[PDB]
């Protein structure tokens, strides 16, 4: 059966400014089947209060989801998105670069 790997982008909703409140996004897309595990990490540990959009899909039937949480960027804190899917032999971690 068809299996497609998620593409992952991790980014903030607004341009990141230390001390100013924002939302950290992990956008997962291009994947099939729809079962996927997505976690937002703050200095390596799982963020608890994470929401996501309602499952929808693209023209080629592959799925997309936005995972997101309220955050206030600082100079020192590191954020990441960690994704597992059937296509990934291990969870894939993508670091937030306040520039991508």
């Amino acid at each position: 059966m068809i299996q497609r790997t998620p593409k992952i982008q991790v980014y903030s909703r607004h341009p990141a400014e230390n001390g100013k409140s924002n939302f950290l996004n992990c956008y997962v897309s291009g994947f099939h089947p729809s079962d996927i595990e997505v976690d937002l990490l703050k200095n390596g540990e799982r963020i608890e209060k994470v929401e996501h959009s309602d499952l929808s899909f693209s023209k080629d039937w592959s799925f997309y989801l936005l995972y997101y949480t309220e955050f206030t960027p600082t100079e020192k804190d590191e954020y990441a998105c960690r994704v597992n899917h059937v296509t990934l032999s291990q969870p894939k971690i993508v670091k937030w670069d306040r520039d991508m």
């Binding site: 059966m1 068809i2 497609r4 593409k7 982008q9 980014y11 909703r13 341009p15 939302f23 996004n25 956008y27 897309s29 291009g30 099939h32 089947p33 729809s34 079962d35 959009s53 309602d54 499952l55 929808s56 899909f57 039937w61 592959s62 799925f63 936005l66 997101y68 520039d99 991508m100």
Partner: protein
């Protein structure tokens, strides 16, 4: 301009873990306005845009009644298709369905569509003429034949040309300030040194609506498609969209490169240069 309304339905079997998951979402252009999730507490169709919250209980009750009926047909469909493909009862399978309609810039019926997938590949689709069906597999011909005998395309055509576009225009009117808006991209560039002899120039488009955008780089006015890293347009979370395009620029060559932005929200396309 042109507009669309589209409903997206996903049903996923969960053998030994109860009923199948069913998720329905509705969109007008790039704006989600309704959802249903079978695993949620409410068991109702629910508003996801502020302009549809003004529809009364008659609307919500009727959309809930219909979405639950969609959920039940997809539940039977999972079983039917498993029998069609001689698959075991153990595995998890996926059905997806999408339908909806477009109007052109005169606001009249332009296009109507309906398609259905099993396990991420085309299963059956209504043709452009809205009278016949395209069936992928040998299994889908049974469905094609069933649907031809029950005159489904006739009934569907009536919806797509009638109800679908009438409600599209109603939503466009009611949500005028959200759906008949454009947000022009707010643009900037960043510059980051790869090494001593080259640097990455990134052209950004933020806070734009609708999602459709062209972002290109040129060098001496020649397009650099092959040499541009272009990311998928991505949701900001607030109903706007983001995109970037980057190129690797050798030392002293920043002035050769122009980033070009086209979006419906712009008075004329932008030509940006690092300088």
């Amino acid at each position: 301009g042109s507009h669309s309304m589209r409903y997206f339905f996903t049903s996923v079997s969960r053998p030994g873990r109860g009923e199948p998951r069913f998720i329905a979402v509705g969109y007008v252009d790039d704006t989600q306005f309704v959802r249903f999730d079978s695993d949620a507490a409410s068991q109702r169709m629910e508003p996801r845009a502020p302009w549809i919250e003004q529809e009364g209980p008659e609307y919500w009750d009727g959309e809930t009644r219909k979405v639950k009926a969609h959920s039940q047909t997809h539940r039977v469909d999972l079983g039917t298709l498993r029998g069609y493909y001689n698959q075991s009862e153990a595995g998890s399978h996926t059905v997806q369905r999408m339908y909806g309609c477009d109007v052109g810039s005169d606001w009249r019926f332009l296009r109507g569509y309906h398609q259905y997938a099993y396990d991420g590949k085309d299963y059956i689709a209504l043709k452009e003429d809205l009278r016949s069906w395209t069936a992928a597999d040998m299994a889908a011909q049974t469905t094609k034949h069933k649907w031809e005998a029950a005159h489904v395309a006739e009934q569907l055509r009536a919806y797509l040309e009638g109800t679908c576009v009438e409600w599209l225009r109603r939503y466009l009117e009611n949500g005028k300030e959200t759906l008949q808006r454009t947000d022009a991209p707010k643009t900037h560039m960043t510059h980051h040194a790869v090494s001593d002899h080259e640097a990455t120039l990134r052209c950004w488009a933020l806070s734009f609506y609708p999602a459709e955008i062209t972002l290109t780089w040129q060098r001496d006015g020649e397009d650099q498609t092959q040499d541009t890293e272009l990311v998928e347009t991505r949701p900001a979370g607030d109903g706007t969209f983001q995109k970037w395009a980057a190129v690797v620029v050798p030392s002293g060559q920043e002035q050769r490169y122009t980033c070009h932005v086209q979006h419906e929200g712009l008075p004329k396309p932008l030509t940006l240069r690092w300088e």
